[PDB]
């Protein structure tokens, strides 16, 4: 009928394809995409989310880049290859969580701004893990397909 | 990659420590730890760099900044040191402190059912086990090493060695409760070990010092020049101060036996400049050579190439302390008797030394000069003393009778330098000595005084007078 | 169960080659870290255990906490000496194991390169590993089933590869050791000590004064007792392959890398080895 | 890794099994004995001889009263018969522990070695170039069954190939010398 | 005390004469060292007011206006409509930090009245269109940091970052 | 109510984050969390447990702060970074042991002081080692992830 | 059977004429086939003697001089000061073996007496300063392989793999 | 200055009469102190030629020989067949090192010509058949170190590491 | 700097005289390595005028002309009707990219007037008739790429591809 998850994946890959300026960051985000959907299927969402935020290094420098990618289109993720790969994938997940109204965008953005409320963000995510893991499947699979299509390998 | 330069050196009574704080242990014998060679090389590199900066830039830099600068030559947590050391010592036998029999079996029954501070003494090649409970049983032992009583005399006639021997000679056994001939045997055997390994003081320990170089590994823009300066500073370290414990009192004083190069494009300027020291004519000529090398570091070499690069960091006075050199305090003499002068150094660097009684006769100023220059001293507020008296001669707001004075040392409110000068137990002595002598029977005595960054007023000519007099009296 | 901890030191002093050294050290670490408690307790005083010693010794008569704190450092030093003294190298396990493995590989038609290297100066290998880390803060690469310190095969392969790389280009390095797109061609095994003169482990110390200090004002010593691998120990490891054109570099590289370092803090001349013997057994 | 006082012989390591593993072995044997003419009464006897004495820790051939396995798990043992033959043809004892204490003792008995990658240019560890790997100790024993259907090629497969299959290279990291392994063929072992 | 000045950096060139100080002290918190801007400040819950562009206090956590700090005091004809405030150098939500601040500082904010007669419907807008990005280097970033073209011949770096680093939310009213 | 290991790890990390005021302490705690897990596996949980306790160097005053950390949420760990980090990790392990009900809070708090207890604590640990080691490591892996994520790299 | 001539490859102008034959037979061992030089010979224990270039026979195994092979006989004025010997094409330290060789091979190498009139202080010499590479590609790599400017447009490939592969040790005296 | 004499130690008897300075002075490169043959020398890329044994130059990095260095000069009717060379005491690959060398040496090598008539396919040889170690002890080790049998009585100890430490490759043709 | 000229390859031989430069420098991005032409150029909205074939500028995004880009200058007789351009190597639609580019380039284009005098219907013209491929080899693929018939005995691997690698639009009007 709708396949709105594919539309959302498309309009999110639109963004993250225009923030990873350096090409290696694109190739590494593709690596993250081809793997984290399998990991989230097997080992649930909360463990994979912890593994993503850990490898992302969400220092306040990056967090500003994400909060800007939310609204702006001239945002650019800054960092190393893998750091921005995991930051882009975290943004993918958070975009889905916002657009589908699972989280309030005001609350999320206010959390990423502060160094403490990020813990409350992770907590509220923990309380919603089953619904999130049931919903985000098609979105993440679409993102995986887009990544392996529109990006050359290494 | 390839071998840069070789050095053949020699040490005067090296006092190298180990895990047991001695030069020999039940397992191996290490008289020259290349770890200490690298550490002291880096320490002299930082000293020489702050010296060069202070002159030709006016400013000083923290140690962390300095070795962040030399990271690519000395290594750090983010880079392997480009220079590998390799100490090769002649007579590197498989020595090890082997103790055959101690045959106590009697002192055990002496100290049982009581508590005694069993001391030790080595009177006339006869180890006696003094007991504070008034007993002096003569112990009969047989060990692997042997002491020609020249070393026994060296230790006994030296107020310095005999002092640090206080820790290695006593145990306050308490055997009124549980006691056994089997465990007291172990205790006293390890005590005789801990006391006999102290007397492994060889003299004139020579060795080679290979210095390899990972040739390029990459060529940074300013590597080669930092390398050459590091070699200059290694030379300085060899010429000033040596390896081991108590190098500020002459022990383990290095002296070049031989030098060599294997990449002329790098070290030749050091090989010739060190061959310079292969034969010293007179004390005046040695002092001339020392002024020559320091001058060369200041004008006759690469003097300012990269200091203008923003990786260093200014020190903060009143909170940080660094040591540089004043090339005017280098009072060379001739000795021709090394044991005597090594023992006499104490007559200079002590509060009640004969060779310092005379120069600074106040008995309230000597303390100030020493606390300022003689490392750390233990002073506590009991009588009308330091907090009243020495504080005067150290607080910068004073009268010029005692020219020297600390930066942040305030009247009754010394904030940070008060502690570091009075309560910090690990502080090197600015007043240092050395006994370079090689390839010619004649032997010399450098006496120099490092320059700190906690002097905000200094009378060079006054302390130079004191240092001249000191270097005279000890001989 | 607690008697095991109380008697572990006696155990080391008596078995000396047939205790599991890994578990022995990990168990005596509990003693070392609860020292004051294991000390202030009626241990069922055993005339043969090393911890009775610290009841009759007296340090800093007045204060008790500092007395215990200095007794603990003495105990750490004694533990290091104990491990060094009692635990020695039986050696025959390794010879039999390597002979068997060589026969196996010969059956599999492998050109073998038997290599024995002797340690020149006392070596540190796997300092960041876990053996004595709980006591000394720095470990040794130890195989707690062969019960013998070992050089990892990965480490030897990596050093050999770095050398052959800097010698013959990354292209040839990958033509020998393989890149991320084709398998290697040379196989290494872990290095185990066959024979040792007198000791296997010996204590040592490192004392950083000015490591990471701003100035002379915060500097202080900080000694770190730690075990090393005594000199004269002779390790042994194999090298096998089938593409017979890869032996020539391995012949050349081996005697040269070992004169440089093979373990940790080699810049200050610690992990230096001699190539005692190279033996080759072609696949025929 | 075992630490134990009061033994006639100090062992450095010891084999360790749990009753669940032996149940699985018996299950394999039962299944293949139903699905084939083959019958292994020797193994089945040796195994249920043990399984009868389940619900507690067992030492097959030793005098180990109690021990500490992998420096974390204190176990009180009891011998089985001092008569039952050794299935693991090596005088090394065989502990057989109850589960829920054997599960950890075995999970904890592997070898996690840490490896790194050196930054060839500055000769330190590369960033993000550090990982651990689990190996299984040397002399670990895995039981398995190979099955075949009648073809007259299968007969030849079991007639010389399985009579000449002795050593193989399993798993990965062969170039670290971590693959070699030997097969026993119970039919000519037991 | 050491007092810095905040400035709105929108696409609106309403910043010509709004300060008194180019340097004042030997340092602005904002630095430009061959690598792009550093210690960029962010102010959240506020928006720009392009018609006389100023920081307006709305109550939306999404409205953020990034800007730069300069050691200064505004024009000695204000404090009627400028938010003056002093913070212990930690509540500063800074971006791309280079060093550390001295744990005390006073700053001013260009304030405009809430004007509760019109809905302050704000919209996001990024700084594009180098036409306005080229001049704004001279318009403010040179008149203040006159080391520009005296140290940086690679202006395009400090040109491409502001193209992407600085942003705000816009009333468009 | 029973809380999963990730929920428990989050709940503990929250209060241990709000108790390390200084930032060097935070970075040191991160450095701990990233290797004490591998150490616990390699050297057992009881050896490593008492290694953490000793290296914490409690001194009966920071021990009071640690005990207060359970009750209050305003408590603050005090000491040097290389000690505050170990005190924080010690509290992490204690929070697990208490919350999972493996060891009573009174017993633990009574240990760490009053030297007579420490040995029976050793014996109790040797009784419960199979209970703890089952999942202490997957509880601490979550701590490792949370620390790598929400704490900068020194 | 056949015969080959070895030639050192240093950064110095000792490469012009130590060889007389250019092609000789049909096949030279060393080939450049759309992946770079192949079948390069490495010799250890020897150093080079750039001043009158020859391989000085030393004993240190660490020193080495790599070169390339061609078929022929030396200059019709030697075989009294050369290490002439025949090896069965499998005892050669060959790098990047392209094909297999006929297991019969006699090689001529520039020898020089070790000159026991000074301590042989050899040093490692890596080929840098690419204009040197452009001179040595013309002096011999053209004088040997006419394929330069006959098929190769990717000469920047053979330039760089020579830059990174060919190293040697010289007395530098 | 100091001139050292190398003597190949294969299982052949070509070492009987080949040096003239048996003692001369009082220093050696190779020694013997209660623990084995200290400071043994090994040379790579060379093999022996048992028919009047000499070291033929090959180019295989696996080809090596183990011998000892003593103070001597051969027969005073030679230096037409030996490689006289001087090395700075670090170009010596020495096993069982004991003493710190004097940074300079001069070495004579028992050398043969490459024999460019047949390929030198070699094969290693080990030291066994104690009748081969029994005699050489009196041929070289007691002809030189007469202090043996006068300081050392456990020649059996030396009979071990001679059977073990020393090896070499031989032409067999 | 660098100058390159793109030469159309329609089915007509109007190309024979449209450049004067055969090599000029040493590298044309159009390369041939044993497998066919690499780094072929394609431009949009353009269709050619085979009768004295020049690039008519259309606007149809389907209008593409496939040719090879060679370094040179056109005939030194033009730029009064030929388009010149300077593009930094990231604005060139190169297909079959094997080697990389020099990060900048000046391009010339054989242009013609729009000729606003008829409906500019272009025709899809695919290179067929390998007989015409043949002369095309000897006309340009041999004059410029002289390496033909010297290295490639597989000219069919350059004959089969041009029948497919090159198709374009012509006006036929």
Q: Which stretch of DSSP H or E encloses residue D29? A: helix D19-34
Closest C-alpha to F123, from F111, F135, F113, F114: F111
Cα atoms in the 13 Å half-sphere on the side-chain side of B331: 22
Output the DSSP codes for C26-64. Answer: HHHHHHHHTHHHHHSS-----TT-TTTHHHH---SSS-S
| CA E29 – CA A122 distance, rounded (Å) | 33
Structural domain harbouring F86 = 5-150
| CA B163 – CA B155 distance, rounded (Å) | 9
Contacts of the segment A75-83: beta carbons below 8 A, 24+ positions apart: A75/A19, A75/E126, A75/E164, A75/E167, A76/A19, A76/A21, A76/E164, A77/A16, A77/A19, A77/A20, A77/A25, A81/A22, A81/A24, A81/A25, A81/A28, A82/A28, A82/A55, A82/D128, A83/A55, A83/A56, A83/A57
Least Cα separation, residue I40 to chain G (angstroms): 16
Query: Closest chain B residue to H89 measured between Cα atoms?
Result: B6
Cα B173 to Cα B189, C35, C36: the distances in Å are: 13, 19, 18
Query: Closest chain D residue to C187 measured between Cα atoms?
Result: D175
Contact A142, A9 (CB under 8 A): yes
A43: Cβ–Cβ under 8 A, 6 or more apart, which residues? none
Between chains, do B262 and G124 touch, taking CB under 8 Å as contact? no
| CA A32 – CA I102 distance, rounded (Å) | 33
| Angle at CA of residue B274, ends B442 and B57, nearest 5° | 115
| Angle at CA of residue B158, ends B155 and B162, nearest 5° | 60
Residue with tokens 């010398």: D177
Residue B386 tokens, joined: 């330091």
Query: Closest chain B residue to H100 measured between Cα atoms?
Result: B90
The torsion angles phi and psi of G64, rounded to 5 degrees, stand at -160, 155
| CA B12 – CA B15 distance, rounded (Å) | 9
| CA H4 – CA B86 distance, rounded (Å) | 25
Closest C-alpha to B215, from H104, C121, G68, C260: C260
What residues of chain D lie within 8 A of the CB of B78, using their CB?
122, 124
Cα C109 to Cα B279, C73, C101, C105, C284: the distances in Å are: 65, 54, 13, 6, 8
What residues of chain F lie within 8 A of the CB of A116, using their CB?
18
Contact H2, H104 (CB under 8 A): yes
Least Cα separation, residue H62 to chain C (angstroms): 5
What residues of chain B lie within 8 A of the CB of H99, using their CB?
90
Contact D108, D29 (CB under 8 A): no
Q: Which of H39, H100, H102, H104 to substitute to test the interface with B, most B CBs within 10 Å?
A: H100
Query: Closest chain G residue to B260 measured between Cα atoms?
Result: G121
Between chains, do E62 and A76 touch, taking CB under 8 Å as contact? no
What secondary structure, in 3-state letters, does chain H show?
A: CCCEEEEECCCCCCCCCCCCCCCCCCCCCCEECCCCEECEEEEECEEECCCCCCEEECCCCCCEEEEEEEECCCCCCCCCCECCEEECCCCCCEECCCCCCCCCEEEECEECCCCCCCCCCCEEEECCCCHHHHHHHHHHHHHHCCCECCCECCHHHHHHHHHHCCEEEECCC
Contact B143, B122 (CB under 8 A): no
Angle, helices C247-257 vs C153-177, to 10°: value is: 140
| CA I89 – CA I102 distance, rounded (Å) | 7
I116: Cβ–Cβ under 8 A, 6 or more apart, which residues? none
CB atoms within 10 A of CB G11: 19
SS3 F148: helix
G48: Cβ–Cβ under 8 A, 6 or more apart, which residues? G8, G10, G14, G54, G55, G56, G65, G125, G168, G169, G170, G171
Residue H135 tokens, joined: 């005699």
CATH number at residue A58: 1.10.520.30
Closest C-alpha to C229, from C199, C259, C207: C199
| CA I74 – CA F48 distance, rounded (Å) | 79
Cα H73 to Cα B97, B286, H121, I113: the distances in Å are: 42, 44, 31, 94
Task: Report the b/e string of B75-112 with b at 16+ CB within 10 A.
Answer: bbeebbbbbbbbbbbeebeebbbebeebebeebbebbe
Between chains, do C252 and H44 touch, taking CB under 8 Å as contact? yes
SS3 G46: strand
| CA C51 – CA C74 distance, rounded (Å) | 11
Between chains, do C217 and B86 touch, taking CB under 8 Å as contact? no
| CA G91 – CA G105 distance, rounded (Å) | 10
SS3 C239: strand
Contact C132, C32 (CB under 8 A): no
Contact H29, H4 (CB under 8 A): yes
Residue with tokens 């694109």: A26
Residue with tokens 């940086």: E152
What residues of chain B lie within 8 A of the CB of G172, using their CB?
264
Output the DSSP codes for E80-93. Answer: SSEEEEEE-SSS--
Query: Taking a contact as any Cβ pair under 8 Å apart, which residues of chain F between 96 and 115 contact chain C?
Result: 115
10 Å CB burial of residue D121 (0-12, 13-18, 19+) is exposed
Residue E63 tokens, joined: 């409205």
What residues of chain G lie within 8 A of the CB of H95, using their CB?
none
Least Cα separation, residue G107 to chain H (angstroms): 9
Q: Which residues pair with C151 in a beta bridge?
A: C191
Contact E56, E48 (CB under 8 A): yes
Please name the chains neighbouring D, where neighbouring means 3+ C-beta pairs under 8 angstroms: B, C, F
Residue D7 tokens, joined: 């033994």
G31: Cβ–Cβ under 8 A, 6 or more apart, which residues? G37, G38, G39, G98, G99
Q: Which of C27, C35, C130 to substitute to test the interface with F, most F CBs within 10 Å?
A: C130
Residue C101 tokens, joined: 């493995």
Chains C and H physically touch (3 or more Cβ atom pairs below 8 Å): yes
Choose the closest CB to D70 out of F38, F44, F134: F44
| CA C89 – CA C20 distance, rounded (Å) | 13
| Angle at CA of residue B113, ends B107 and B116, nearest 5° | 55
| CA C264 – CA D116 distance, rounded (Å) | 13
Query: Closest chain F residue to D74 measured between Cα atoms?
Result: F126
Within its chain, how far is the Cα of B126 from the centroid? 31
Between chains, do G97 and C245 touch, taking CB under 8 Å as contact? yes
Residue B322 tokens, joined: 């660094």
A137: Cβ–Cβ under 8 A, 6 or more apart, which residues? A37, A41
| CA D28 – CA A81 distance, rounded (Å) | 49
CB atoms within 10 A of CB C239: 26
10 Å CB burial of residue B207 (0-12, 13-18, 19+) is buried
Chains D and C physically touch (3 or more Cβ atom pairs below 8 Å): yes
Q: Which stretch of DSSP H or E encloses residue F138? A: helix F136-150
Strands I105-109 and I3-8: parallel
Between chains, do H95 and C120 touch, taking CB under 8 Å as contact? no
The size of chain A, in residues, is 154
Strands E56-57 and E82-87: unpaired
Among chain H, residues having any CB pair with chain B shorter than 8 Å are 88, 90, 98-100, 103
B344: Cβ–Cβ under 8 A, 6 or more apart, which residues? B355, B473, B474, B475
Within its chain, how far is the Cα of A103 from the centroid? 14
What residues of chain D lie within 8 A of the CB of F126, using their CB?
74
The torsion angles phi and psi of G47, rounded to 5 degrees, stand at -120, 170
Sign of the four-CA dihedral H77, H81, H85, H91: negative
Between chains, do F38 and D73 touch, taking CB under 8 Å as contact? no
First vs last C-alpha separation in chain I: 38
Cα E7 to Cα E70, E98, E132: the distances in Å are: 8, 20, 17
Strand intervals (E) in B177-242: 205-213
| CA F13 – CA A84 distance, rounded (Å) | 25
CB-based contact, F48 to chain C, within 8 Å: yes
What residues of chain E lie within 8 A of the CB of A105, using their CB?
62
What residues of chain F lie within 8 A of the CB of A115, using their CB?
150
Rg (CA), chain D: 21
| CA C246 – CA C175 distance, rounded (Å) | 9
Between chains, do D3 and C23 touch, taking CB under 8 Å as contact? yes
Closest C-alpha to B56, from B273, B240, B229, B223: B229
Number of domains in chain A: 1
What residues of chain F lie within 8 A of the CB of C42, using their CB?
none
| CA B67 – CA C226 distance, rounded (Å) | 26
The torsion angles phi and psi of B2, rounded to 5 degrees, stand at -150, 160
H-state helical runs in F60-115: 62-71, 81-99, 105-110
Please name the chains neighbouring I, where neighbouring means 3+ C-beta pairs under 8 angstroms: G
Contacts of the segment A35-41: beta carbons below 8 A, 24+ positions apart: A36/A89, A36/A140, A37/A137, A37/A140, A37/A141, A37/A143, A37/A144, A40/A133, A40/A136, A40/A140, A41/A137
Among chain G, residues having any CB pair with chain C shorter than 8 Å are 36, 42, 44, 61-62, 64, 93-97, 161, 164-165, 167
Task: Report the b/e string of B269-281 with b at 16+ CB within 10 A.
Answer: bbbebbeebeebe
Query: Taking a contact as any Cβ pair under 8 Å apart, which residues of chain C between 117 and 136 contact chain H?
Result: 120
Task: Report the b/e string of D38-76 with b at 16+ CB within 10 A.
Answer: eebeebbebbeebeeebeebbbbbbebeebbbbbbbbbe
What is the DSSP code (8-state) at residue D113? E
Between chains, do B2 and G123 touch, taking CB under 8 Å as contact? yes
H-state helical runs in B350-451: 354-357, 366-373, 390-394, 417-422
Rg (CA), chain G: 15
Contact G59, G44 (CB under 8 A): no
Task: Report the b/e string of I123-161 with b at 16+ CB within 10 A.
Answer: eebebeeeeebeebbeebbeebbebbeeebeeeeebbeb
Between chains, do C23 and D174 touch, taking CB under 8 Å as contact? no
Between chains, do G153 and I34 touch, taking CB under 8 Å as contact? no
């Amino acid at each position: 009928l709708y396949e709105e998850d594919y539309k959302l994946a498309l309009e999110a890959f639109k963004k993250v394809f225009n923030a990873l300026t350096h090409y290696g960051a694109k190739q590494a985000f593709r690596s993250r995409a081809r793997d984290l959907v399998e990991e989230i299927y097997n080992s649930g969402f909360i463990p994979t989310f912890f593994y993503i935020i850990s490898k992302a290094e969400l220092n306040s420098d990056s967090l500003d880049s994400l909060i800007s990618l939310f609204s702006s289109d001239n945002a650019i993720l800054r960092g190393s290859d893998e750091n921005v790969s995991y930051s882009a994938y975290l943004f993918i997940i958070l975009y889905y969580l916002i657009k589908r109204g699972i989280i309030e965008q005001k609350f999320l953005i206010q959390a990423l701004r502060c160094e403490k409320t990020r813990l409350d963000l992770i907590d509220k995510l923990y309380n919603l893990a089953p619904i999130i893991s049931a919903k985000i499947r098609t979105y993440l699979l679409a993102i995986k397909r887009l990544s392996e299509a529109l990006i050359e390998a290494r | 990659e390839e071998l840069l330069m070789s050095l053949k050196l020699k040490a005067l009574y090296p006092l190298t420590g180990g895990y047991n704080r001695h030069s020999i242990n039940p397992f191996y014998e290490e008289l020259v730890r290349p770890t200490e060679i690298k550490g002291l090389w880096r320490w002299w590199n930082r000293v020489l760099f702050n010296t060069l900066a202070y002159s030709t830039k006016g400013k000083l830099y923290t140690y962390e900044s300095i070795d962040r600068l030399f990271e690519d030559v000395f290594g750090s947590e983010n880079k392997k040191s480009a220079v590998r050391l390799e100490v090769i010592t002649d007579e590197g036998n498989d020595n090890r402190f082997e103790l055959s029999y101690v045959e106590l079996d009697k002192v055990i029954d002496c100290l049982r059912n009581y508590k005694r501070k069993v001391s030790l003494d080595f009177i006339d090649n006869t180890l006696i086990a003094e007991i504070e409970g008034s007993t002096k049983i003569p112990i009969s032992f047989k060990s692997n090493l042997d002491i020609d009583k020249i070393i026994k005399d060296l230790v006994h006639n030296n107020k310095l060695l005999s002092f640090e021997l206080l820790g290695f000679k006593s145990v306050e056994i308490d055997a009124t409760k549980i006691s056994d001939k089997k465990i007291l045997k172990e205790i006293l055997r390890d005590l005789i070990t801990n006391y006999l390994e102290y007397f492994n003081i060889k003299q004139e320990v020579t060795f080679t010092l290979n210095i390899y170089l990972d040739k390029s590994r990459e060529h940074k823009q300013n590597f080669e020049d930092k390398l050459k300066f590091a070699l200059y500073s290694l030379l300085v370290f060899i010429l000033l101060g040596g390896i081991g414990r108590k190098t500020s009192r002459g022990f383990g004083s290095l002296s070049i036996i031989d030098v060599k190069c294997y990449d002329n494009s790098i070290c030749k300027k050091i090989e010739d400049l060190a061959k310079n020291f292969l034969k010293i004519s007179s004390g005046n000529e040695l002092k001339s050579k020392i002024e020559s090398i320091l001058d060369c570091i200041k004008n006759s070499c690469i003097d300012t190439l990269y200091i203008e690069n923003n990786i260093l960091s200014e020190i903060d006075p009143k909170k940080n302390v660094v040591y540089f050199i004043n090339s005017d305090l280098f009072e060379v003499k001739r000795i021709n008797d090394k044991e005597k002068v090594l023992a006499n150094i104490y007559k200079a660097v002590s509060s009640e030394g004969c060779c310092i009684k005379s120069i600074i006769t106040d008995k309230y100023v000597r303390k100030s000069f020493l606390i300022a220059f003689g490392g750390y001293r233990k002073v506590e507020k009991d009588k009308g003393l330091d907090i009243g008296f020495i504080k005067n001669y150290l607080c910068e707001t004073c009268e010029t009778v005692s020219s020297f004075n600390i930066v942040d040392f305030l009247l009754s409110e010394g904030s940070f330098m008060s502690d570091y000068i009075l309560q910090y137990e690990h502080r090197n002595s600015l007043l240092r000595f050395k006994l370079i002598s090689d390839n010619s029977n004649n032997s010399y005595l450098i006496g120099y005084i490092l320059h700190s960054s906690y002097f905000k007023k200094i009378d060079i000519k006054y302390v130079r007078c004191i240092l001249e007099k000191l270097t005279y009296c000890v001989i | 169960a607690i008697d095991f901890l109380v008697n572990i030191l006696e155990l080391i002093k008596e078995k000396q080659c047939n205790i599991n050294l890994f578990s022995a050290i990990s168990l005596t670490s509990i003693v070392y870290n609860n020292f004051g408690e294991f000390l202030s307790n009626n241990q069922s005083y055993s005339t043969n255990n090393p911890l009775l010693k610290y009841h009759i010794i007296i340090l800093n008569d007045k204060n008790k906490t500092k007395d215990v704190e200095e007794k603990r450092n003495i105990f750490k030093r004694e533990v290091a000496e104990l491990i060094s003294r009692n635990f020695k190298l039986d050696g025959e396990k390794v010879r039999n194991y390597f002979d068997s493995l060589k026969e196996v590989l010969k059956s599999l038609k492998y050109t073998i390169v038997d290599v024995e290297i002797t340690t020149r100066t006392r070596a540190l290998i796997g300092v960041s590993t876990s053996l004595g880390k709980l006591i000394f803060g720095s470990g040794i690469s130890f195989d707690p089933y062969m019960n013998l310190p070992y050089i990892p095969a990965s480490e030897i392969k990596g050093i050999v590869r770095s050398y052959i790389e800097g010698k013959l280009g990354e292209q040839e390095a990958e033509e020998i050791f393989g890149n991320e797109e084709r398998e290697g061609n040379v196989n290494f095994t872990d290095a185990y000590p066959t024979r040792s003169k007198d000791f296997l482990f010996v204590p040592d110390v490192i004392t950083p004064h000015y490591n990471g200090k701003k100035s002379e004002a915060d500097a202080e010593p900080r000694p770190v007792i730690h075990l090393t691998i005594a000199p004269k120990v002779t390790f042994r490891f194999l090298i096998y392959y089938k593409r017979e054109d890869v032996g020539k570099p391995i012949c050349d590289s081996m005697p040269i890398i070992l004169i440089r370092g093979l373990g940790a803090r080699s810049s200050v001349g610690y992990s230096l080895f001699e190539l005692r013997k190279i033996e080759v057994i072609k696949a025929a | 890794r075992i630490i134990e006082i009061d033994s006639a012989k100090p062992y450095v390591w010891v084999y360790v099994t749990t009753y669940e593993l032996l149940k699985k072995v018996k299950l394999y044997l039962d299944s293949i004995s139903q699905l084939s003419n083959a019958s292994f009464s020797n193994l089945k006897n040796k195994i249920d001889t043990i399984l009868a004495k389940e619900g507690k820790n067992i030492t097959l051939d030793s005098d180990l009263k109690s021990a500490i396995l992998n420096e974390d798990f204190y176990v009180e043992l009891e011998a089985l018969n001092n008569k039952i033959p050794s299935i693991i043809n090596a005088g090394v004892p065989l502990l057989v522990l109850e589960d829920s204490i054997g599960r950890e003792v075995i999970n904890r008995s592997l070898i996690r070695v840490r490896r790194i990658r050196i930054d060839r240019d500055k000769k330190v560890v590369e960033t993000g170039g550090l990982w651990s790997e689990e190996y299984v100790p040397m002399k670990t024993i895995f039981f398995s069954v190979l099955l075949g259907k009648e073809s007259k090629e299968s007969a030849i497969f079991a007639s010389c190939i399985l009579r000449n299959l002795r050593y193989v290279i399993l798993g990965g990291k062969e170039t670290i010398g971590k693959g070699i392994v030997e097969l026993r063929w119970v039919k000519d072992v037991i | 005390s050491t007092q810095r000045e905040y400035v709105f950096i929108p696409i609106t060139n309403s910043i010509t004469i709004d300060v008194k100080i180019t340097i004042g002290g030997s340092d602005h918190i904002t630095n430009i060292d061959e690598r792009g801007i550093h210690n960029v400040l962010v102010i959240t819950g506020y928006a720009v007011d392009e018609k006389n562009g100023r920081l307006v206090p709305t109550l939306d956590p999404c409205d953020y206006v990034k800007g730069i700090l300069v050691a200064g005091t505004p024009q000695q004809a204000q404090s009627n409509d400028f938010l003056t405030l002093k913070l212990p150098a930690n509540k500063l939500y800074l971006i791309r930090k280079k060093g550390n601040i001295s744990d005390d500082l006073k700053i001013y904010i260009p304030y405009s009245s809430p004007d509760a007669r019109n809905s302050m419907k704000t919209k996001p807008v990024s700084i594009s269109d180098d036409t306005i990005v080229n001049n704004i280097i001279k318009e403010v970033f040179d008149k203040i940091y006159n080391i520009t073209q005296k140290e940086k011949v690679k202006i395009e770096k400090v040109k491409e970052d502001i193209k992407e680093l600085f942003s705000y939310y816009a009333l468009e009213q």
